[PDB]
Amino acid sequence: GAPPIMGSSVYITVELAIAVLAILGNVLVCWAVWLNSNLQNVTNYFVVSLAAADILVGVLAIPFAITISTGFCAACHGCLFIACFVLVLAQSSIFSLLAIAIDRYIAIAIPLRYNGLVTGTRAAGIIAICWVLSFAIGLTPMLGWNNCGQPKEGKAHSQGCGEGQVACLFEDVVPMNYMVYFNFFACVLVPLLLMLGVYLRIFAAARRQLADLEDNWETLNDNLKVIEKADNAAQVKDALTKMRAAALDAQKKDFRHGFDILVGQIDDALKLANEGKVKEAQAAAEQLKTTRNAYIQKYLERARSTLQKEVHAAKSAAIIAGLFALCWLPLHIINCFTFFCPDCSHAPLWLMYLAIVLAHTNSVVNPFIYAYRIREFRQTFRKIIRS
Ligand SMILES: CC(C)CCC[C@@H](C)[C@H]1CC[C@H]2[C@@H]3CC=C4C[C@@H](O)CC[C@]4(C)[C@H]3CC[C@]12C
Ligand SMILES: CC(C)CCC[C@@H](C)[C@H]1CC[C@H]2[C@@H]3CC=C4C[C@@H](O)CC[C@]4(C)[C@H]3CC[C@]12C
Ligand SMILES: CC(C)CCC[C@@H](C)[C@H]1CC[C@H]2[C@@H]3CC=C4C[C@@H](O)CC[C@]4(C)[C@H]3CC[C@]12C
Ligand SMILES: CC(C)CCC[C@@H](C)[C@H]1CC[C@H]2[C@@H]3CC=C4C[C@@H](O)CC[C@]4(C)[C@H]3CC[C@]12C
Ligand SMILES: CCCCCCCC/C=C/CCCCCCCC(=O)OC[C@H](O)CO
Ligand SMILES: CN1CCN(CCNc2nc(N)n3nc(-c4ccco4)nc3n2)CC1
Ligand SMILES: CCCCCCCC/C=C/CCCCCCCC(=O)O
Ligand SMILES: CCCCCCCC/C=C\CCCCCCCC(=O)O
Ligand SMILES: CCCCCCCC/C=C\CCCCCCCC(=O)O
Ligand SMILES: CCCCCCCC/C=C\CCCCCCCC(=O)O
Ligand SMILES: CCCCCCCC/C=C\CCCCCCCC(=O)O
């Protein structure tokens, strides 16, 4: 039995290293949003709330985790707060991650009414509510769902704890049925699965809208060939009627003028077609190629460019949520083994603290994702560092 302070010194040193990196990186995130007006959107307000939770992981949760690893004597409910405050920060992260996913879905599903629905004032109120809910969820053991009424008195006596005190150890005070059923299943796993469902809807809507743009572009060019290879005025009319409906469908200053010309030129050729003037209608329909090459094609490429940027932004948000799941799932899975398999030997000490360190590492990764995937963050990061 090697001296416990040796393994403890390694765990504590790693925790402190994580705390420094979590504070430095996420302070840089909040500083960037504060300085850059181009970063001051509703999505990044939840990014700031998420960064604030990770700053608090380094300032409070990691010092709390170091303290509870010692098993020091404490009043049980005070021990509960040390043990459960990190659950508040994790729950706040979940609410921020879910809000970001919903915000990205609203922006791609109904972009016409996004600015009227998703505002900064409403976002700040949602953030405040979610922080209150995170305290209620994370500190639910302090409301009575704890093991303080049944303290391990032999462990407390062996450590010389005073009357009314317990050896402050996580699994001694926090019930595992709370950790598995309430915290993990209901409050972590279900919202993460909801996020997965939201992101599936986002990318499916992106693929559908990109296909609709390509369908309107092909229908525009196909019916142009139909008019050229037509023989009577009726065939020209059928092709022009489908072009006009598709032109107004794709329409949903330089953008409006381009479609004003297109629909007007379609109406010109339609009127000639209704008069039986096939040659004159085809010549008028050939003028549509000038409007297509000078206006319509530019709108197709810009609308495609906008959707691809929304896909890129939605993937950046999905990576953050996936990394949260990857960093926290091992610790939750270990709790499931402890809870559901009492015949299984408890996960060893080194693995417990590896899972704890890994969960804390998640408070370091998000500033790197923003730097590698978001040019506006990366450029603002460089300006802050150089200055
Ligand atoms: C605003 C921020 C910075 C203040 C941080 C306050 C923290 C550090 C305080 C608030 C409540 C405190 C706990 C309250 C009760 C107990 C029980 C006692 O038997 C041992 C200490 C212990 C476990 C305290 C540890 C420190 C503690 C968690
Ligand atoms: C900004 C908001 C969250 C205010 C933060 C204040 C919180 C962290 C402080 C304020 C008063 C504190 C409590 C004061 C007294 C006790 C009784 C003790 O037996 C256990 C700890 C406990 C329960 C403290 C836990 C932490 C506490 C709840
Ligand atoms: C989310 C991704 C990273 C998958 C994580 C898988 C990890 C958390 C899984 C894979 C294998 C698992 C271990 C397999 C077997 C045992 C022996 C048992 O007596 C206690 C639990 C313990 C020690 C498990 C703990 C959790 C474990 C380490
Ligand atoms: C929903 C998916 C994507 C991720 C969550 C998977 C979790 C809930 C699953 C994956 C592996 C599972 C464990 C695998 C094996 C055992 C050993 C058995 O004696 C009791 C249950 C227990 C401990 C399972 C509990 C639930 C578990 C931890
Ligand atoms: C002992 C424990 C004490 C610790 C106490 C923890 C309290 C939780 C703090 C949350 C800060 C929230 C971060 C602020 C993010 C809000 C984003 C924002 O400011 O948006 C502005 C608005 O949207 C424009 O109109
Ligand atoms: C005998 N063993 C010695 C080592 N002990 C380690 C106690 N620390 C600990 N233990 C657990 N189970 N969790 N779960 C969590 C968590 C937080 C969020 C989701 O999960 N944190 C934890 N911290 C366990 C007993
Ligand atoms: C731990 C489970 C918590 C369940 C509690 C349910 C109530 C929470 C509801 C929150 C929605 C908040 C919207 C209303 C805000 C109005 C504030 C006001 O009166 O000005
Ligand atoms: C910027 C402010 C950040 C706060 C710095 C906090 C750093 C201290 C870290 C851990 C404190 C651990 C206290 C140890 C518990 C007592 C051990 C015992 O009594 O057996
Ligand atoms: C962030 C805004 C604050 C919202 C807080 C809402 C949830 C509060 C939950 C638990 C606080 C319980 C404090 C415990 C009292 C002392 C217990 C005791 O002495 O035995
Ligand atoms: C919907 C979110 C609202 C926030 C939570 C509601 C307020 C909770 C009220 C009181 C909590 C009191 C803390 C309990 C003290 C000691 C209880 C115990 O011995 O376990
Ligand atoms: C990101 C996934 C994390 C896995 C990376 C593995 C790195 C750390 C692994 C092991 C260090 C902990 C000590 C392992 C051997 C200890 C055996 C023992 O003390 O009984």
Ligand code: NA
């Ligand atoms: Na987090």
